[PDB]
Design a protein around this ligand. Structure first.
Ligand SMILES: [Cl-]
Ligand SMILES: [Cl-]
Lengths: 219, 218
């Protein structure tokens, strides 16, 4: 019943603006104060600003020059606008009643905003199971996901049917300015002749999906 | 305005250990008590554990307790459990007639100590397909090990490499509290085809495991 839902996420060019809405259901948005919070990938939480129940907006000093927080009671929303964006503004944006001293606390699910100076779909190469794989033992295989921008890429195996033993590494930023990652899985070596292993790589920023069958390499 | 200064930035503790995390407010928080503690596990949203310094939210395990006095606030985990791997944040509120501000601490990454475990090590040559692009990626995998600290050195025809590799590490596992780590060596096609023996040398403590291949050989 009680819920907050962020909308408006997406890709923005540097110098662009973001506009996120936070829609409440189960209560009136004007009966409580709400914060906007963000988290850069792999980093901590940052408070942007807070709109009191009375409708007064207070911003972290760094955000005041380019942020606006408003409320619309007819639509039961709170809204964050931020302009003149830079790469450092890439983050998951949440609306929330933080509940620092009251029982009622509620967060939206979060919406990703990515500030991108470039778009580039990934190249995907097999990490082939070793020919030295131990019979009746365990083999490693995977996919190398190279030279894409911006983050993120998602990787499944066999369309989600293979999850046990999978490690998809966090991406590294190469000296080229492009990201690269690998996703690996360990499987029974006795399966290598019989079981098909396909990595499914998805890069929404470039609307690119790659499915790559990874097989033992030919001698 | 208000800041929350959190320490330590990270800690490792054995299951059943008592863990203490502190947060110092840069000035008095609202009514001296508007401080909450949040927990965030990998890939999920922050979850509130404790509010008003010490009020444990319903359904939060009682091994989490909050205390505070003055401008110092403390999160205590009395018997660290495996499911407590997370980053913990304090968040404080400052208020006046013309002020309403919030500040998060930097976060404390809590990792679970476990018994040392040696990695399964794998080396992967570059694919023929990639080589057509002019570049070769050689990948070395250290699977399911502990602790995270490892030295991974690349050798090309017995020559130690420097400056042409990058590492990545997984977050601590939920099943075995291990890590996995990749090291990726990047060479031009020209250089890759100029050499024969490729080796990844993994050192932890007193032991080095080296996995290698000869270019072209099966
Ligand atoms: Cl109050
Ligand atoms: Cl903050």
């Amino acid at each position: 019943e009680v819920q907050l839902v962020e909308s408006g996420g997406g890709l923005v060019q540097p110098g662009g603006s973001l506009r996120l809405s936070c829609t409440a259901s189960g209560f009136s948005i004007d009966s409580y104060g709400f914060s906007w919070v963000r988290q850069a990938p792999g980093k901590g939480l940052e408070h942007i600003g807070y709109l009191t129940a009375g409708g007064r907006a207070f911003y972290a000093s760094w955000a005041k020059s380019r942020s606006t927080i408003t409320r619309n009671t007819n639509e039961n929303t709170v809204t964050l606008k931020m302009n003149s964006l830079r790469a450092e503004d890439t983050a998951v944006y949440y609306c929330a009643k933080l509940g620092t001293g009251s029982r009622f606390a509620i967060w939206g699910q979060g919406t990703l905003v990515t500030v991108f100076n470039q778009i580039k779909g990934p190249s995907v190469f097999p990490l082939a199971p070793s020919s030295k794989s131990t019979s009746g033992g365990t083999a490693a295989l995977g996919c190398l996901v190279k030279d894409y921008f911006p983050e993120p890429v998602t990787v499944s195996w066999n369309s989600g049917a293979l999850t046990s033993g999978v490690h998809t590494f966090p991406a590294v930023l190469q000296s080229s300015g492009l990201y690269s990652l690998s996703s690996v899985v360990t499987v029974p070596s006795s399966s290598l002749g019989t079981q098909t292993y396909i990595c499914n790589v998805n890069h929404k920023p470039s609307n690119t999906k790659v499915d790559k069958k990874v097989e033992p390499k030919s001698c | 305005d208000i800041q929350m200064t959190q320490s330590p930035s990270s800690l490792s503790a054995s299951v059943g250990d008592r863990v203490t995390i502190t947060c110092r407010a840069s000035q008095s928080v609202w009514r001296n008590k508007f401080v909450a503690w949040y927990q965030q596990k990998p890939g999920k949203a922050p979850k509130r554990l404790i509010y008003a310094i010490a009020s444990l939210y319903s359904g939060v395990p009682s091994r989490f307790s909050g205390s505070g006095s003055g401008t110092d606030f403390t999160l205590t985990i009395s018997s660290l459990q495996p499911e407590d791997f997370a980053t913990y944040y304090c968040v404080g509120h400052y208020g006046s007639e013309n002020d309403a501000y919030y500040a998060f601490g930097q976060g404390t990454k809590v990792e679970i100590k476990r018994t040392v475990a040696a990695p399964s090590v794998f080396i992967f040559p570059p694919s023929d397909e990639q080589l057509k692009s002019g570049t070769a990626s050689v990948v070395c995998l250290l699977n399911n090990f502990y602790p995270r600290e490892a030295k991974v050195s690349w050798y090309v025809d017995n020559a130690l490499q420097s400056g042409n590799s990058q590492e990545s590490v997984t977050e601590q596992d939920s099943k075995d509290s291990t890590y996995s780590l990749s090291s990726t060596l990047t060479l031009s096609k020209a250089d890759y085809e100029k050499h024969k023996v490729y080796a990844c040398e993994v050192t932890q403590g007193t032991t080095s495991v080296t996995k290698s291949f000869n270019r072209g050989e099966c």
